[PDB]
Amino acid sequence: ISRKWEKKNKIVYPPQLPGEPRRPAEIYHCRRQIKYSKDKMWYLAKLIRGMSIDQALAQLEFNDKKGAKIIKEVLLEAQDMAVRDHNVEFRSNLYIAESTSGRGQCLKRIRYHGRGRFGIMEKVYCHYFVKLVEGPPPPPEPPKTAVAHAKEYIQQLRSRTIVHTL
Amino acid sequence: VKKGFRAAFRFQKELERQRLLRCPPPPVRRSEKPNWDYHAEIQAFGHRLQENFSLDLLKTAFVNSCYIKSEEAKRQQLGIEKEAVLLNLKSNQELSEQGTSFSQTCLTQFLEDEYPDMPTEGIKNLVDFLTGEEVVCHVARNLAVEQLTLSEEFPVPPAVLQQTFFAVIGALLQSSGPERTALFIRDFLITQMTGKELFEMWKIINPMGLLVEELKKRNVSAPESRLTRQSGGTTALPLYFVGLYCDKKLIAEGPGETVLVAEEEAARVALRKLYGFTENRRPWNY
Amino acid sequence: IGIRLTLPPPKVVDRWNEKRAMFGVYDNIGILGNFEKHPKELIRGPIWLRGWKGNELQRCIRKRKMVGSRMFADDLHNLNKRIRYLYKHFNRHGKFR
Amino acid sequence: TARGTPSRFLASVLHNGLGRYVQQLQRLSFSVSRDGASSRGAREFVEREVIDFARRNPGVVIYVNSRPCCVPRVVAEYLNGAVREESIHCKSVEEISTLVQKLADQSGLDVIRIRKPFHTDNPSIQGQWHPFTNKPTTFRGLRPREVQ
Amino acid sequence: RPRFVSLRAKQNMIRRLEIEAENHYWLSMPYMTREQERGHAAVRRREAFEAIKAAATSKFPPHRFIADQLDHLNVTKKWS
Amino acid sequence: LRNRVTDRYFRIQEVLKHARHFRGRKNRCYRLAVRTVIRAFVKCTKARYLKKKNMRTLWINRITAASQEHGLKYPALIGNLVKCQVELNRKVLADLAIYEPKTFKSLAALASRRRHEGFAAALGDGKEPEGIFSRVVQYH
Amino acid sequence: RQWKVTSEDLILIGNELDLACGERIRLEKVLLVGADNFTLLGKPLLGKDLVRVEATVIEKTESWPRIIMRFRKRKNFKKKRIVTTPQTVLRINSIEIAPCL
RNA sequence: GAAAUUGAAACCUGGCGCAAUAGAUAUAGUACCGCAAGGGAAAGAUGAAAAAACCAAGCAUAAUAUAGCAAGGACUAACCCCUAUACCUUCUGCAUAAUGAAUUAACUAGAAAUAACUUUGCAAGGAGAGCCAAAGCUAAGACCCCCGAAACCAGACGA
RNA sequence: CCGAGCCUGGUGAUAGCUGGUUGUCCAAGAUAGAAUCUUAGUUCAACUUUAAAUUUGCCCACAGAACCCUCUAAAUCCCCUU
RNA sequence: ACUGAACUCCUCACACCCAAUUGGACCAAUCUAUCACCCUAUAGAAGAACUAAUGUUAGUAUAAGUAACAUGAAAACAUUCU
RNA sequence: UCUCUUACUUUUAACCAGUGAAAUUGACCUGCCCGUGAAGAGGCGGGCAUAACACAGCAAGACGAGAAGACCCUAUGGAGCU
Ligand SMILES: [Mg+2]
Ligand SMILES: [Mg+2]
Ligand SMILES: [Mg+2]
Ligand SMILES: [Mg+2]
Ligand SMILES: [Mg+2]
Ligand SMILES: [Mg+2]
Ligand SMILES: [Mg+2]
Ligand SMILES: [Mg+2]
Ligand SMILES: [Mg+2]
Ligand SMILES: [Mg+2]
Ligand SMILES: [Mg+2]
Ligand SMILES: [Mg+2]
Ligand SMILES: [Mg+2]
Ligand SMILES: [Mg+2]
Ligand SMILES: [Mg+2]
Ligand SMILES: [Mg+2]
Ligand SMILES: [Mg+2]
Ligand SMILES: [Mg+2]
Ligand SMILES: [Mg+2]
Ligand SMILES: [Mg+2]
Ligand SMILES: [Mg+2]
Ligand SMILES: [Mg+2]
Ligand SMILES: [Mg+2]
Ligand SMILES: [Mg+2]
Ligand SMILES: [Mg+2]
Ligand SMILES: [Mg+2]
Ligand SMILES: [Mg+2]
Ligand SMILES: [Mg+2]
Ligand SMILES: [Mg+2]
Ligand SMILES: [Mg+2]
Ligand SMILES: [Mg+2]
Ligand SMILES: [Mg+2]
């Protein structure tokens, strides 16, 4: 096994110079060996990927999936430790930067079939990983405008050369 | 576990390369890196450019004021300033000044001889370009001036490296005389002009204004702008050629996406023809 | 991935231990010692292999002949089967006949 | 293959042979073993050939390290800042002399695919073709099916 | 599938026929008769075969030099 | 296991490095990668012939275009230039068409002139003086 | 090969020229020489007196490795060769014309 | 496939053996399977003290945009253009037919003679008794795979 | 899982049959047959490979190679010179 | 007339496009002798190289989050009801 | 049963939550028509078509998948019976 995500909170950066923008706080937190499919967990992880902490918690609270409450617990723990240990100013002033599911260590069992024959059943486990970053959630990338497309196309035309010549 | 050493060693080497690629080390000056002898290097610098340099003068050319300050401060901090009293190394000011002055004068001389029709402003701007931080630093980098220069910080800031390069010019001036140094300027700085449009080197604003002033200087009629050729006027991709006529005689024709852009282009074409910076101009004689 | 992520502990070989230093001594016992002893007598190993050489089948026949009686029952059975198999292989099988 | 590899256009460092030709090779470092069969040829090279090479190429600084090593190497550095490491392991004197001369002749440009076997900054003298070249002008510049 | 003869194919055929017709003509006039020809190249032909025979007979193992054997000692040539 | 391969990683990597830019499991799975890489290398070797061929058809296409601007056909241009004892290959003629259009017009003019000299010679059966551009420089 | 060259132009020659780097050579065999307003073209070559083109050797290199691969299916036929071709880079220094017509 | 006949030297604590799919089946004849005789596994890795970094497949980071053995030639440019009928094995010959492969890691298949050839030593003799010899004899080098039946017999174990 | 149980041994049974047979590079290299419980195989010849010895090999021109049957051609064999 | 190959020429180079088979030049890694000492040299050895055996063991995919599986109701969770 | 099928209930189903297999799989960026390949083409040629992604149906094709067959032939392969 590897447990690198835990070690990520142990990084210490040198003190910042006065003439430097303030570094946003990063918090790394994970739950290991969740009895739940990583594939099922993925959807919930994807859901809250860009969201603020409060938005994410709201969405998870009213979700019907088993993994939703597990992510809610992990998020709450992360929010708490962010303020306590990592010197985050406001508990609300956090957004999900990374939200991922990974495979866990699994167990093989036997599934009996309707003859002498059988199948191998696998008890799924997963890890949930989250990275929280201090600050407002970054604005979503705006949909490409007609003018943007037009500009790109002109750029393509202007870029072209006489090929296979002097 | 397989018995053997060679495979494990090879793999260690691979992992080392992977670590280096993933996390590249901060740039380090060549002086600090092994296989370095300063005296051998400066001699080789001289020989590379097929020129005779005074060793002492060239040494002086490479040393910088910031380096001297840093060395003094380091000696003060270490506590051996009184113990290791030594004559202060000569600064970079004198040689750099002499080199810069000579470079500018010879560039103006070359440019004036080759292009007589050019105005003073234009030649000034072209000399400025050739003596600019960009090209001079590029030449300096690729002549191993950065390697030999003694500086406070690495990589060497562009201002310092420019100064050092002109110091080298100055050292050569004192060593080999003006004519040899002129040949050096021609071989390095002038060659940067090759494959470049005039207005790429000399940035201009309102070329039509420049053109009308130039034509009234030569006592001819003000240019008349006419649409020579046109394609796809209503489309998002039009081509327009506009021509400039002086007493119903063609001086320049310029293409553009719009009429206004075409006008500007025609004006620039006109200026190129007037000043003699045509694409088909006689190439520089070396 | 079947490659080790650390170097193996370095091998130190004493090239001048007593065994290596005195290797080859008495190989010329016969020619320098009035032929009182053959060099083959210096060979230390199995009774059946002392100063003799032969292929797998020949070696097995020799082992059975010489130490066969003293062998363990299971070992003797294996040797019998080995000879029986090697007989069939060498006599009945191959490319050249 | 080309699609699997980077490419570049034909280029010089600083318009090398335009004003005056400047040898691109700057430094040449040799790692040779006093004892060791790999560096045998290398040793013999250092004994006879390196002095003459140094005389022939004054612009290049030659370093000879003479340290314990299983494989002897030559490191070539160029003015543009390229570094090339070449193994002279179990090579004859002739082979090493050949390789060293090649390094001297080479510039610092990467030995990758060169897209065009020629390079020009002024391809045209008469003026690059456009659709309106080889087209006649018309009176009053009238488009087809234009009344006025 | 039926194949048909084009004009190009006919032209290609007649071109070759024209060449071979000229070939016939140049084979028509021999410089020497058969009787005059007899034994003119015999001496050269013979000597050529003796050259072949000499090559065949000269087959033998190459020379072996003491220098070649001793030069292998140079594998352990070292600096002091 | 008295002897077993310790260098298999590097043997795999030699093939795999060429497969990196492929899509699918071909890029990473050796069994599949090796087959595609052999094909890639074979194609690469055979492509040299096509490169040369494709360049020439490109040149001919370009020459045809430029000739047609001057109202001349491709066979006319090439044929008559050869008859004028000028030996300019198709690569250079295509380059001239793009970059030196005045020179190309001159060559088109020369070809056209020679073409008319040919027609005049053909029409004028018997004893007639040779065309000015028709006459050929003799080398001995 | 026919090379359309101008002043300060680089060309890659796919062979070793047996010339030291920095050596200036005159390229004979000029077919066509053109300006903005005139062209002179020889039959097939222009005279020596008429035109002079000068180049210099600036670089002598190996080409990037070229793969030669042979494969025939179901025959157990597979060959691989790596070739590098010697190369020379020439800088066309000057083109000069003398009044000889 | 003999025998008469000849003749046999004696120092254990060593290894050009394996190193967790290897070497014993073995951490164990255990767990498990079978009424029974019987078959028969798998696996462990900190540090002096616990009274102290990168790499297989699979995925995720990061779904997708006309078109086609997945590439190659390329190109300013990923794609667009042009070129290109997967690999192995079998059948008298043919592949495009049929066979085999989800993928990764590890494991998994040419063993020896007579006679010849090559290189030495000695030479009408060679060989450290025997054997060969009308240039031979002595020594060395160098050629001969893997998996799979239905069966047959012997001795046990089973109503 | 009985046209003759199961287990162990003989046993690495045997299989002219099926499948498989693992680095790189170069070179030479293809279709007369005979016998055989033989045509799914093997042995000899033919062809192929290597090494060695020695002289001819191939291409060929005059001359030359049957009558009978009442017919019969392209050709073939042999062969100096070249 | 032109287009049109790996044919031929051109610049440079050259052992570098057949099945079975046969001859030759090299060689990965390992162990040993002696070297060497950031990973090698000359030799001697050998369980000496795997894109393929419905190969063996292990891991992880695909089909697939599919097929399939499960708890009568209310409530004080005392109990009652169906 | 059918002419000639319809309506309703339960199971299944589909959706939501939990748990979670199997045969199968060379790689696939997996179209249509005509032709070619002795039949037979998603992939070859000539035409045509073509933003990209789910979910639910279907069984015309992928000589669709798994064994087990039946037919003919072969083995100097077995076995039972007479
Ligand atoms: Mg049951
Ligand atoms: Mg074990
Ligand atoms: Mg075991
Ligand atoms: Mg991976
Ligand atoms: Mg296509
Ligand atoms: Mg299959
Ligand atoms: Mg009973
Ligand atoms: Mg009973
Ligand atoms: Mg068998
Ligand atoms: Mg061959
Ligand atoms: Mg018989
Ligand atoms: Mg038979
Ligand atoms: Mg048979
Ligand atoms: Mg004859
Ligand atoms: Mg062609
Ligand atoms: Mg070729
Ligand atoms: Mg050829
Ligand atoms: Mg050749
Ligand atoms: Mg093996
Ligand atoms: Mg493998
Ligand atoms: Mg397999
Ligand atoms: Mg489904
Ligand atoms: Mg269901
Ligand atoms: Mg359903
Ligand atoms: Mg569900
Ligand atoms: Mg399965
Ligand atoms: Mg069809
Ligand atoms: Mg098609
Ligand atoms: Mg569907
Ligand atoms: Mg198909
Ligand atoms: Mg039988
Ligand atoms: Mg039998």
Side-chain angles (χ1 to χ4, degrees), chain G residues 15 70 72 78-79 81:
Chain G
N15 76 345
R70 274 84 219 248
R72 297 169 195 179
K78 177 171 85 178
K79 296 138 79 80
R81 190 183 174 184

PDB file of all heavy atoms in Angstrom, chain G residues 15 70 72 78-79 81, chain J residues 11-12 16-18 51:
ATOM      1  N   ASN G  15      26.051  14.074 -48.374  1.00  0.00           N
ATOM      2  CA  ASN G  15      27.316  13.361 -48.472  1.00  0.00           C
ATOM      3  C   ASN G  15      28.419  14.170 -47.787  1.00  0.00           C
ATOM      4  O   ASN G  15      28.256  15.364 -47.541  1.00  0.00           O
ATOM      5  CB  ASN G  15      27.645  12.987 -49.924  1.00  0.00           C
ATOM      6  CG  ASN G  15      28.135  14.136 -50.786  1.00  0.00           C
ATOM      7  OD1 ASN G  15      28.004  15.303 -50.433  1.00  0.00           O
ATOM      8  ND2 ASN G  15      28.720  13.819 -51.926  1.00  0.00           N
ATOM      9  N   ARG G  70      12.328  -4.741 -42.657  1.00  0.00           N
ATOM     10  CA  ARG G  70      11.732  -5.693 -43.578  1.00  0.00           C
ATOM     11  C   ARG G  70      10.892  -6.679 -42.774  1.00  0.00           C
ATOM     12  O   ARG G  70      11.349  -7.192 -41.752  1.00  0.00           O
ATOM     13  CB  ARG G  70      12.823  -6.437 -44.357  1.00  0.00           C
ATOM     14  CG  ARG G  70      13.308  -5.721 -45.609  1.00  0.00           C
ATOM     15  CD  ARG G  70      14.374  -4.683 -45.327  1.00  0.00           C
ATOM     16  NE  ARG G  70      14.163  -3.515 -46.168  1.00  0.00           N
ATOM     17  CZ  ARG G  70      14.953  -3.127 -47.160  1.00  0.00           C
ATOM     18  NH1 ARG G  70      16.053  -3.801 -47.453  1.00  0.00           N
ATOM     19  NH2 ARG G  70      14.644  -2.043 -47.846  1.00  0.00           N
ATOM     20  N   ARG G  72       7.845  -9.881 -43.670  1.00  0.00           N
ATOM     21  CA  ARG G  72       6.900 -10.656 -44.459  1.00  0.00           C
ATOM     22  C   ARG G  72       6.137 -11.572 -43.508  1.00  0.00           C
ATOM     23  O   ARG G  72       6.748 -12.259 -42.689  1.00  0.00           O
ATOM     24  CB  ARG G  72       7.627 -11.489 -45.518  1.00  0.00           C
ATOM     25  CG  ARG G  72       8.382 -10.674 -46.555  1.00  0.00           C
ATOM     26  CD  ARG G  72       9.285 -11.558 -47.391  1.00  0.00           C
ATOM     27  NE  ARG G  72      10.260 -10.777 -48.138  1.00  0.00           N
ATOM     28  CZ  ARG G  72      11.194 -11.280 -48.940  1.00  0.00           C
ATOM     29  NH1 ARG G  72      11.296 -12.586 -49.116  1.00  0.00           N
ATOM     30  NH2 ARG G  72      12.028 -10.468 -49.564  1.00  0.00           N
ATOM     31  N   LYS G  78      11.986 -11.051 -40.572  1.00  0.00           N
ATOM     32  CA  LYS G  78      12.030  -9.764 -39.894  1.00  0.00           C
ATOM     33  C   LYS G  78      13.481  -9.314 -39.750  1.00  0.00           C
ATOM     34  O   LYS G  78      14.294 -10.009 -39.143  1.00  0.00           O
ATOM     35  CB  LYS G  78      11.314  -9.848 -38.541  1.00  0.00           C
ATOM     36  CG  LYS G  78      11.356  -8.583 -37.695  1.00  0.00           C
ATOM     37  CD  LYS G  78      10.465  -8.639 -36.470  1.00  0.00           C
ATOM     38  CE  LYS G  78      11.108  -9.299 -35.267  1.00  0.00           C
ATOM     39  NZ  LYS G  78      10.209  -9.281 -34.090  1.00  0.00           N
ATOM     40  N   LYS G  79      13.781  -8.135 -40.310  1.00  0.00           N
ATOM     41  CA  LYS G  79      15.110  -7.547 -40.266  1.00  0.00           C
ATOM     42  C   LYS G  79      14.993  -6.078 -39.869  1.00  0.00           C
ATOM     43  O   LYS G  79      14.045  -5.402 -40.265  1.00  0.00           O
ATOM     44  CB  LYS G  79      15.787  -7.641 -41.637  1.00  0.00           C
ATOM     45  CG  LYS G  79      16.079  -9.049 -42.140  1.00  0.00           C
ATOM     46  CD  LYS G  79      15.776  -9.237 -43.615  1.00  0.00           C
ATOM     47  CE  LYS G  79      16.837  -8.694 -44.550  1.00  0.00           C
ATOM     48  NZ  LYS G  79      17.993  -9.613 -44.680  1.00  0.00           N
ATOM     49  N   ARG G  81      17.590  -2.551 -39.555  1.00  0.00           N
ATOM     50  CA  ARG G  81      18.850  -1.851 -39.750  1.00  0.00           C
ATOM     51  C   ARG G  81      18.668  -0.383 -39.369  1.00  0.00           C
ATOM     52  O   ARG G  81      17.612   0.198 -39.609  1.00  0.00           O
ATOM     53  CB  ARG G  81      19.314  -1.992 -41.204  1.00  0.00           C
ATOM     54  CG  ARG G  81      20.730  -1.500 -41.466  1.00  0.00           C
ATOM     55  CD  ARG G  81      21.126  -1.589 -42.927  1.00  0.00           C
ATOM     56  NE  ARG G  81      22.426  -0.969 -43.140  1.00  0.00           N
ATOM     57  CZ  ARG G  81      23.024  -0.804 -44.317  1.00  0.00           C
ATOM     58  NH1 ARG G  81      22.447  -1.221 -45.431  1.00  0.00           N
ATOM     59  NH2 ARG G  81      24.207  -0.221 -44.373  1.00  0.00           N
TER      60      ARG G  81
ATOM     61  P     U J  11      27.626  11.317 -60.369  1.00  0.00           P
ATOM     62  OP1   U J  11      28.764  12.083 -60.942  1.00  0.00           O
ATOM     63  OP2   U J  11      27.663   9.831 -60.397  1.00  0.00           O
ATOM     64  O5'   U J  11      27.394  11.792 -58.867  1.00  0.00           O
ATOM     65  C5'   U J  11      27.545  13.175 -58.487  1.00  0.00           C
ATOM     66  C4'   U J  11      27.344  13.329 -57.000  1.00  0.00           C
ATOM     67  O4'   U J  11      25.935  13.173 -56.696  1.00  0.00           O
ATOM     68  C3'   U J  11      28.048  12.289 -56.141  1.00  0.00           C
ATOM     69  O3'   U J  11      29.364  12.730 -55.826  1.00  0.00           O
ATOM     70  C2'   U J  11      27.172  12.228 -54.897  1.00  0.00           C
ATOM     71  O2'   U J  11      27.489  13.241 -53.969  1.00  0.00           O
ATOM     72  C1'   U J  11      25.779  12.488 -55.468  1.00  0.00           C
ATOM     73  N1    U J  11      24.946  11.292 -55.689  1.00  0.00           N
ATOM     74  C2    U J  11      24.132  10.881 -54.646  1.00  0.00           C
ATOM     75  O2    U J  11      24.100  11.443 -53.565  1.00  0.00           O
ATOM     76  N3    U J  11      23.359   9.780 -54.919  1.00  0.00           N
ATOM     77  C4    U J  11      23.306   9.064 -56.096  1.00  0.00           C
ATOM     78  O4    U J  11      22.555   8.091 -56.180  1.00  0.00           O
ATOM     79  C5    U J  11      24.167   9.556 -57.130  1.00  0.00           C
ATOM     80  C6    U J  11      24.941  10.625 -56.895  1.00  0.00           C
ATOM     81  P     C J  12      30.556  11.673 -55.673  1.00  0.00           P
ATOM     82  OP1   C J  12      31.787  12.428 -55.326  1.00  0.00           O
ATOM     83  OP2   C J  12      30.557  10.797 -56.872  1.00  0.00           O
ATOM     84  O5'   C J  12      30.102  10.790 -54.425  1.00  0.00           O
ATOM     85  C5'   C J  12      30.464  11.170 -53.089  1.00  0.00           C
ATOM     86  C4'   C J  12      29.553  10.537 -52.065  1.00  0.00           C
ATOM     87  O4'   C J  12      28.184  10.465 -52.542  1.00  0.00           O
ATOM     88  C3'   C J  12      29.818   9.089 -51.697  1.00  0.00           C
ATOM     89  O3'   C J  12      30.998   8.843 -50.942  1.00  0.00           O
ATOM     90  C2'   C J  12      28.537   8.745 -50.946  1.00  0.00           C
ATOM     91  O2'   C J  12      28.500   9.227 -49.618  1.00  0.00           O
ATOM     92  C1'   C J  12      27.490   9.476 -51.793  1.00  0.00           C
ATOM     93  N1    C J  12      26.772   8.568 -52.713  1.00  0.00           N
ATOM     94  C2    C J  12      25.726   7.791 -52.198  1.00  0.00           C
ATOM     95  O2    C J  12      25.416   7.917 -51.003  1.00  0.00           O
ATOM     96  N3    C J  12      25.070   6.936 -53.017  1.00  0.00           N
ATOM     97  C4    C J  12      25.433   6.829 -54.298  1.00  0.00           C
ATOM     98  N4    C J  12      24.760   5.971 -55.068  1.00  0.00           N
ATOM     99  C5    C J  12      26.500   7.601 -54.847  1.00  0.00           C
ATOM    100  C6    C J  12      27.140   8.445 -54.024  1.00  0.00           C
ATOM    101  P     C J  16      24.708  -6.044 -49.769  1.00  0.00           P
ATOM    102  OP1   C J  16      23.973  -6.543 -50.962  1.00  0.00           O
ATOM    103  OP2   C J  16      25.379  -4.724 -49.825  1.00  0.00           O
ATOM    104  O5'   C J  16      23.736  -6.024 -48.510  1.00  0.00           O
ATOM    105  C5'   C J  16      22.781  -7.076 -48.268  1.00  0.00           C
ATOM    106  C4'   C J  16      22.027  -6.783 -46.993  1.00  0.00           C
ATOM    107  O4'   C J  16      22.984  -6.453 -45.951  1.00  0.00           O
ATOM    108  C3'   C J  16      21.044  -5.615 -47.069  1.00  0.00           C
ATOM    109  O3'   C J  16      19.813  -5.846 -46.393  1.00  0.00           O
ATOM    110  C2'   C J  16      21.787  -4.475 -46.383  1.00  0.00           C
ATOM    111  O2'   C J  16      20.940  -3.534 -45.756  1.00  0.00           O
ATOM    112  C1'   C J  16      22.627  -5.227 -45.351  1.00  0.00           C
ATOM    113  N1    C J  16      23.852  -4.495 -45.000  1.00  0.00           N
ATOM    114  C2    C J  16      23.984  -3.986 -43.702  1.00  0.00           C
ATOM    115  O2    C J  16      23.085  -4.211 -42.875  1.00  0.00           O
ATOM    116  N3    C J  16      25.088  -3.273 -43.379  1.00  0.00           N
ATOM    117  C4    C J  16      26.032  -3.053 -44.299  1.00  0.00           C
ATOM    118  N4    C J  16      27.106  -2.350 -43.935  1.00  0.00           N
ATOM    119  C5    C J  16      25.918  -3.549 -45.631  1.00  0.00           C
ATOM    120  C6    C J  16      24.819  -4.253 -45.937  1.00  0.00           C
ATOM    121  P     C J  17      18.507  -6.220 -47.221  1.00  0.00           P
ATOM    122  OP1   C J  17      18.470  -5.377 -48.439  1.00  0.00           O
ATOM    123  OP2   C J  17      17.355  -6.180 -46.288  1.00  0.00           O
ATOM    124  O5'   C J  17      18.795  -7.730 -47.645  1.00  0.00           O
ATOM    125  C5'   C J  17      18.244  -8.298 -48.846  1.00  0.00           C
ATOM    126  C4'   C J  17      16.921  -8.951 -48.534  1.00  0.00           C
ATOM    127  O4'   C J  17      15.926  -7.923 -48.277  1.00  0.00           O
ATOM    128  C3'   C J  17      16.342  -9.849 -49.623  1.00  0.00           C
ATOM    129  O3'   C J  17      15.675 -10.965 -49.039  1.00  0.00           O
ATOM    130  C2'   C J  17      15.334  -8.937 -50.318  1.00  0.00           C
ATOM    131  O2'   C J  17      14.285  -9.649 -50.945  1.00  0.00           O
ATOM    132  C1'   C J  17      14.825  -8.095 -49.147  1.00  0.00           C
ATOM    133  N1    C J  17      14.323  -6.762 -49.526  1.00  0.00           N
ATOM    134  C2    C J  17      12.976  -6.456 -49.293  1.00  0.00           C
ATOM    135  O2    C J  17      12.244  -7.317 -48.780  1.00  0.00           O
ATOM    136  N3    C J  17      12.507  -5.232 -49.634  1.00  0.00           N
ATOM    137  C4    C J  17      13.330  -4.332 -50.181  1.00  0.00           C
ATOM    138  N4    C J  17      12.824  -3.138 -50.504  1.00  0.00           N
ATOM    139  C5    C J  17      14.705  -4.617 -50.426  1.00  0.00           C
ATOM    140  C6    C J  17      15.156  -5.831 -50.084  1.00  0.00           C
ATOM    141  P     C J  18      16.467 -12.318 -48.709  1.00  0.00           P
ATOM    142  OP1   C J  18      16.828 -12.301 -47.266  1.00  0.00           O
ATOM    143  OP2   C J  18      17.533 -12.501 -49.729  1.00  0.00           O
ATOM    144  O5'   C J  18      15.368 -13.435 -48.991  1.00  0.00           O
ATOM    145  C5'   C J  18      14.967 -14.378 -47.982  1.00  0.00           C
ATOM    146  C4'   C J  18      13.699 -15.078 -48.402  1.00  0.00           C
ATOM    147  O4'   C J  18      13.609 -15.085 -49.853  1.00  0.00           O
ATOM    148  C3'   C J  18      13.601 -16.540 -48.002  1.00  0.00           C
ATOM    149  O3'   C J  18      13.089 -16.663 -46.676  1.00  0.00           O
ATOM    150  C2'   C J  18      12.639 -17.098 -49.045  1.00  0.00           C
ATOM    151  O2'   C J  18      11.269 -16.890 -48.759  1.00  0.00           O
ATOM    152  C1'   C J  18      13.036 -16.304 -50.294  1.00  0.00           C
ATOM    153  N1    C J  18      13.997 -16.986 -51.186  1.00  0.00           N
ATOM    154  C2    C J  18      13.591 -18.136 -51.879  1.00  0.00           C
ATOM    155  O2    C J  18      12.435 -18.558 -51.720  1.00  0.00           O
ATOM    156  N3    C J  18      14.471 -18.760 -52.697  1.00  0.00           N
ATOM    157  C4    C J  18      15.708 -18.274 -52.842  1.00  0.00           C
ATOM    158  N4    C J  18      16.543 -18.923 -53.659  1.00  0.00           N
ATOM    159  C5    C J  18      16.145 -17.105 -52.154  1.00  0.00           C
ATOM    160  C6    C J  18      15.263 -16.494 -51.350  1.00  0.00           C
ATOM    161  P     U J  51       8.385 -11.800 -26.127  1.00  0.00           P
ATOM    162  OP1   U J  51       9.418 -11.680 -27.190  1.00  0.00           O
ATOM    163  OP2   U J  51       8.458 -10.922 -24.927  1.00  0.00           O
ATOM    164  O5'   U J  51       6.963 -11.616 -26.817  1.00  0.00           O
ATOM    165  C5'   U J  51       5.738 -11.689 -26.060  1.00  0.00           C
ATOM    166  C4'   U J  51       4.561 -11.809 -26.998  1.00  0.00           C
ATOM    167  O4'   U J  51       4.628 -10.742 -27.976  1.00  0.00           O
ATOM    168  C3'   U J  51       4.509 -13.086 -27.825  1.00  0.00           C
ATOM    169  O3'   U J  51       3.861 -14.137 -27.116  1.00  0.00           O
ATOM    170  C2'   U J  51       3.710 -12.665 -29.054  1.00  0.00           C
ATOM    171  O2'   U J  51       2.308 -12.751 -28.898  1.00  0.00           O
ATOM    172  C1'   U J  51       4.109 -11.195 -29.213  1.00  0.00           C
ATOM    173  N1    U J  51       5.103 -10.938 -30.268  1.00  0.00           N
ATOM    174  C2    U J  51       4.640 -10.780 -31.563  1.00  0.00           C
ATOM    175  O2    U J  51       3.459 -10.857 -31.860  1.00  0.00           O
ATOM    176  N3    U J  51       5.616 -10.534 -32.497  1.00  0.00           N
ATOM    177  C4    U J  51       6.974 -10.429 -32.281  1.00  0.00           C
ATOM    178  O4    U J  51       7.724 -10.204 -33.231  1.00  0.00           O
ATOM    179  C5    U J  51       7.373 -10.602 -30.916  1.00  0.00           C
ATOM    180  C6    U J  51       6.447 -10.844 -29.980  1.00  0.00           C
TER     181        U J  51
END
